Amino acid sequence: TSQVRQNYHQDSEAAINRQINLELYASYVYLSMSYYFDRDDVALKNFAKYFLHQSHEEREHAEKLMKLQNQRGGRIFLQDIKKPDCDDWESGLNAMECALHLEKNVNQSLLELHKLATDKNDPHLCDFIETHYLNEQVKAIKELGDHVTNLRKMGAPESGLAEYLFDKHTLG
Amino acid sequence: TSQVRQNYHQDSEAAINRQINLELYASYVYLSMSYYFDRDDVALKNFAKYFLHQSHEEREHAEKLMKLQNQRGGRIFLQDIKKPDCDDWESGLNAMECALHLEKNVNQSLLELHKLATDKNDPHLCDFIETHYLNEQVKAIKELGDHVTNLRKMGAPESGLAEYLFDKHTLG
Amino acid sequence: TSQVRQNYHQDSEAAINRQINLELYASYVYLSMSYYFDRDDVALKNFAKYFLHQSHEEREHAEKLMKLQNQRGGRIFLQDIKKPDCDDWESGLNAMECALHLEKNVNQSLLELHKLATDKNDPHLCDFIETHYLNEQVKAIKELGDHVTNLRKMGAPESGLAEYLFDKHTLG
Amino acid sequence: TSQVRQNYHQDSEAAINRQINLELYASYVYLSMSYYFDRDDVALKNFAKYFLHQSHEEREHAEKLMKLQNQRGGRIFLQDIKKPDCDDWESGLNAMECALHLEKNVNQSLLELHKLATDKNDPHLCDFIETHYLNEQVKAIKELGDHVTNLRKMGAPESGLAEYLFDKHTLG
Amino acid sequence: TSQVRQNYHQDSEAAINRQINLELYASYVYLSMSYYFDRDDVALKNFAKYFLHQSHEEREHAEKLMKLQNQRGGRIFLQDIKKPDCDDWESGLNAMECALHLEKNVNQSLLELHKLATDKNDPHLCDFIETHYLNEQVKAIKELGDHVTNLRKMGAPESGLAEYLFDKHTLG
Amino acid sequence: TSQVRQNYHQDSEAAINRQINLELYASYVYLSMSYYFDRDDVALKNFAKYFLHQSHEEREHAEKLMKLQNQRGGRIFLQDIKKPDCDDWESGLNAMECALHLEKNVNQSLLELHKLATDKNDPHLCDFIETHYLNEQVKAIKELGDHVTNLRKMGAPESGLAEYLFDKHTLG
Amino acid sequence: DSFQVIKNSPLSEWLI
Amino acid sequence: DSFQVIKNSPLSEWLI
Amino acid sequence: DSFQVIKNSPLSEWLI
Amino acid sequence: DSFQVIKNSPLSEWLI
Amino acid sequence: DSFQVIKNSPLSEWLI
Amino acid sequence: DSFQVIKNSPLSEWLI
Ligand SMILES: [Fe+3]
Ligand SMILES: [Fe+3]
Ligand SMILES: [Fe+3]
Ligand SMILES: [Fe+3]
Ligand SMILES: [Fe+3]
Ligand SMILES: [Fe+3]
Ligand SMILES: [Fe+3]
Ligand SMILES: [Fe+3]
Ligand SMILES: [Fe+3]
Ligand SMILES: [Fe+3]
Ligand SMILES: [Fe+3]
Ligand SMILES: [Fe+3]
């Protein structure tokens, strides 16, 4: 229907719209993570700064998928952004575990999104996921994996000194 | 309950949480506005750039209310961000009319938010709305008022030349 | 036969030679487009400058395919560059419509060229099309799509003021 | 017929169109020369660079004749660009001999093109050939004459060392 | 088993370990090549410098595969680095022929390594080979192909002047 | 046999070849040490950076012995580089203990290598070991001695905080 | 429409 | 939990 | 028109 | 060869 | 020769 | 262990 639409399936178009909500949802969880560590009874400044950067990164991932849908001739369909599943995080380690479990879920959705472009014989869409999303989802999971293993080696979350020093040396 | 909580009512705390959703909802509508003008059949670059800036401005208004809730000892409660009420905008003039009608609704919510702080005898909360929200909501409505009146003077939305020239000289 | 030839099919070699003529033909059409708008009875300088840049861009796309054939051990076979199908373009909008219809045809030839490398199990050739040709063919079609839709909104080709202002603000 | 046409014969107009094909054909032969020396079994980098520059020089000679036809009120007529007569060049010396024989043929066509402007009493067209084409066609033939005589003095094409050293010291 | 492991097969993990030995073995052969030309009875400085750079390049290719195994959750398994198959190289041309035959063997191992990631449906691993290994293995083979054909044109290895001049102009 | 060979024994020549394997083996162990601390379940960045530098230092020690063999008229003989004896290191302290035990073994081999040059009356070879190898092997053992004693004072390897802080302040 | 639904919500739905 | 609800949604709910 | 003639040409006409 | 074919073409084949 | 020995090794010899 | 095997090797195994 679009004048610039060529080799673009409806299933690929609908799968991009679903991914846009998944990145918008992810930035909402990172927004709720950042301002939990800004609380007076938590008071971890570099933990709040770290999750604030993650919030603005998932927003640009949703904006790049919104931009890709326009070049391919697709039409963006927007839905509700659901609230985060947890309104309280136990500690800094528990937040890094819920962020590692979140990135692995985002990476899983991209793998089947890449598996749908291949089935549809859409080579431009396959290269867009590999260049902008597949490579950065492995560094993100690896980096969060390092952060979690460095936290429970110091004795977190039982050791409040462990969270404070990780917040200073690693995150700062 | 919070160690830093002083002269902070539950009603003022709950009204801030409602306002946070209202700014988060507003940035979602501006996000759907920006990428409508990025469409190939619309193709108004400076209209898309203008509403993209409005999207990142309502996000910082929600982040500043999230930060204010932490200093006063309140606890942030997050809800669903509802999808925009319109998935298609008739034209550039129709979008400026739906953005003017949106800002006037945001300004109305701040007026009763200021009317609740006064009733609660919360002078710090009253000054926070006047300094950061009341002043900028009048310039926003005034600026959108200028944009709408300059559009239907040229003959928009019937004149496609009117939208193109406003997009170049005014928005660019 | 070549000392550097490895995992390079004759069908992939012959398909590259066909693509070289298709880019050389495309630059010939853009050359005939540029100097049509240089005519005294047309006199659109930035339309001529825009299609002159497109002419030298399709030449570098043909030169990069000529260079890729040498690294893979293939031998370049050259044929006649056919004359453009139209010696007169109705207007600026009609030229952008014949250039949009041209890029979509070039993009189609790359898709089956990518479909032949995949069948041949040539992963280096697949990555060469995705990196240098598939990504730039979607921006080209999207950009020409914007240009066409901004022309018939102003009232082109009936409005001679529409072509003149688009030539100044957009193309200049 | 053109509003800017004055003292411009149809025979002069048609002779310019023929010359445009002759420069476009010449750049096609230089394009096939450059990428022959890029081959792995030839591997003469500065020979490929030398003929690549000659390819982009005959293109600007065809573009300047296309521009001259518009100022004089003539209309450009484009035909097929024929493929080069040779798909394999014996060596570097054989290519310089086929390029010397090509420039002398281009120079011959300009001499009768200058002989037609004089017969037509077209003094502006006569000065355009003398300033931009006649002077540069004698330096081109002289330079290729030097290159050929310096190649068969070293012992080319029998001596592969002769081609390699000429490619380094002279062409590099 | 690893906390960051997702969509990573044991066969892909074991194939990376095999490739690490293949790059470590390749740098060992280039190390034995470089110091052969440093010998007093050979004395080709830029041949030694050229193969010394190739030695440190195959080491970084093995280090990048060692780094990729950690991000994907795999565990590096190291084996013996076998000694080079030749302890004496006949000449400079014979070394470029044994290095061309080596790169073509390394490129073959990457092609089936790319054929295993595709079968395993590992799109991140496929893009890692195409971006960092497939593209650079074709330039390497092409460059060594040029070097070999420029050596036996001068008369190498019979001509000792041929090796000396290639060592100066080309490699220096 | 070599034209530049003077006062160079076969026993000294063979002892240099053995030392080249010992430095090449040492860099292989440091390579396996560096990428153990890059693992997600270890995640000590400055431990990995420290052993990566040690890997490239033992490679230059093997390259300097390869260069010394050529100046003295000897011929390099290369053998297999054996795999490291340990594929898993218990902790950061256990790696510094296996690196201290490695350097002391390398230093022992240089002492008898210096004891063989003296017996052979080779004063140039004696000065080459003293200037480039004997002095740097004592600083290396002293530095690793400091690192080990500072690790088990903090409570390593039982204290995971001890490894993390040493990795930050000392190694970083 | 969606703006007034959030605005008219009682304050009890916005407290933790 | 909320992540799998969006992920398992059929593609028909994401087309205009 | 001229674009599809080149595109539909068999691969045997593009080998040396 | 191909150069003289274009050169010997009559001027009527080069006018629009 | 030594290159094909490593290349033909089964994948079981490259797992920990 | 592997370090002493190389170190104890006779000098005849290190000459060409
Ligand atoms: Fe993302
Ligand atoms: Fe992320
Ligand atoms: Fe606001
Ligand atoms: Fe606003
Ligand atoms: Fe192209
Ligand atoms: Fe293009
Ligand atoms: Fe010329
Ligand atoms: Fe010339
Ligand atoms: Fe490599
Ligand atoms: Fe290489
Ligand atoms: Fe050393
Ligand atoms: Fe050392």
Author numbering:
A (entry chain A), B (entry chain A), C (entry chain A), D (entry chain A), E (entry chain A), F (entry chain A): 6 to 177
G (entry chain B), H (entry chain B), I (entry chain B), J (entry chain B), K (entry chain B), L (entry chain B): 484 to 499
Can you list sentences taken from the study reporting this PDB entry?
The interaction between nuclear receptor coactivator 4 (NCOA4) and the iron storage protein ferritin is a crucial component of cellular iron homeostasis. The binding of NCOA4 to the FTH1 subunits of ferritin initiates ferritinophagy—a ferritin-specific autophagic pathway leading to the release of the iron stored inside ferritin. NCOA4 is mostly intrinsically disordered, and the structural basis for its interaction with ferritin is unknown.
Here, we show the cryo-electron microscopy (Cryo-EM) structure of the NCOA4FB in complex with FTH1.
